[PDB]
Amino acid sequence: DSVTLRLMTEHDLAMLYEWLNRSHIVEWWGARPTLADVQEQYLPSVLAQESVTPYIAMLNGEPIGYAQSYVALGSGDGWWEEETDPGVRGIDQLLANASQLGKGLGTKLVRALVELLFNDPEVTKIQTDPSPSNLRAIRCYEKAGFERQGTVTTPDGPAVYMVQTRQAFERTRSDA
Ligand SMILES: CC(=O)SCCNC(=O)CCNC(=O)[C@H](O)C(C)(C)COP(=O)(O)OP(=O)(O)OC[C@H]1O[C@@H](n2cnc3c(N)ncnc32)[C@H](O)[C@@H]1OP(=O)(O)O
Ligand SMILES: N[C@@H]1[C@@H](O)[C@@H](O[C@@H]2[C@@H](O)[C@H](O[C@H]3O[C@H](CO)[C@@H](O)[C@H](O)[C@H]3N)[C@@H](N)C[C@H]2N)O[C@H](CO)[C@H]1O
Ligand SMILES: [Ca+2]
Ligand SMILES: [Ca+2]
Numbered sequence: 001d002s003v004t005l006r007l008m009t010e011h012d013l014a015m016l017y018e019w020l021n022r023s024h025i026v027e028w029w030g031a032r033p034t035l036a037d038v039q040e041q042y043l044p045s046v047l048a049q050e051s052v053t054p055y056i057a058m059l060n061g062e063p064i065g066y067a068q069s070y071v072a073l074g075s076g077d078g079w080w081e082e083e084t085d086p087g088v089r090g091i092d093q094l095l096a097n098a099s100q101l102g103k104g105l106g107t108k109l110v111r112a113l114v115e116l117l118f119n120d121p122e123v124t125k126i127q128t129d130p131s132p133s134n135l136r137a138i139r140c141y142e143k144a145g146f147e148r149q150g151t152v153t154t155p156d157g158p159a160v161y162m163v164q165t166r167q168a169f170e171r172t173r174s175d176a
Contacts (some may be wrong), residue, residue, distance in 0.1 A: 001060055003108040005067065007114055008054035013039050016066055024098045028134055051075065057093070057109045060169070064100060067093035067113050072127060078155040087124030089117045102136070110144035116170050125166065129159035145172055 008016070019025060027031055033041070040046065047054055051071035056063045072080040073086040080090070091113055095106055103126040117123050128146060130137035138148070138160055146162040153159075 003105065003112050004058045005055040005112055006058060008056050008066070009043060010043060012056055013042060015063065016042055019066060019094065019096045022098065024101065027092050028137070029094055031112055059105070064097060064105065065093060065095040065109055067091065067109060069113065069117055087122055088127055089123050090127045090129065092128070106140045108145045110141060114144065114164060114169065118166055123166065126164045128162045129154060130159055132158055145169065
């Protein structure tokens with residue numbers, strides 16, 4: 001059914017810790033953080049100082065994944081140094097359950113996150129940066145309305161820079 005987003009809290013950290021150690025996640029995210037790693041890195045107030053907002057994806061009253069949005073400009077640590085536009089938001093996300101992968105749930109999560117961010121009238125464009133090897137994530141982002149721009153170097157290595165502008169989001173709301 002319907003994928004929604006709520007803010008992540010401190011109460012979600014043990015669950016997030018478990019998720020980040022599942023093999024389908026460890027593969028693409030990180031790696032293998034301890035409980036204390038997750039607690040000190042993903043505490044919502046700690047993420048705040050990075051301009052990162054954490055969310056839990058919800059489906060039929062159950063938590064099914066983690067997402068984050070961030071302000072690209074001024075990200076620090078070598079991140080997004082050529083950005084000039086404070087309206088740009090980036091996203092990252094994962095699905096908690098291996099049994100639920102490749103069933104279009106990720107596309108729904110991404111669509112829900114993109115709609116959320118464009119409801120901040122200050123947001124001009126959403127970016128994402130899946131690794132070149134992560135073809136499944138790239139295809140998920142494409143189905144969700146993102147377009148591949150090219151390869152950029154990040155502190156996590158080269159990435160496929162993908163974007164969806166507000167104008168593209170407006171134009172793809174109706175077929176009128
Ligand atoms: C910037 C970043 O966040 S980097 C990426 C982040 N996270 C991860 O990779 C964590 C582990 N993976 C996940 O949590 C999830 O797979 C997500 C969120 C990346 C994507 O969600 P999913 O539900 O699996 O994707 P969804 O099914 O909606 O779409 C994936 C597409 O790739 C295709 N696909 C499925 N498996 C693969 C694969 N192994 N290789 C290539 N393509 C694949 C699917 O068929 C679908 O395309 P199609 O509908 O045209 O046939
Ligand atoms: N100052 C930064 C802050 O801007 C922010 O950077 C963002 C990262 O989090 C994202 O990576 C995450 O998602 C990836 C999956 O998409 C995982 O492969 C990765 O393991 C995970 N970390 C990047 N894709 C985009 C960055 N802008 O968070 C950092 C540490 O948490 C801070 O140092
Ligand atoms: Ca505002
Ligand atoms: Ca239209």
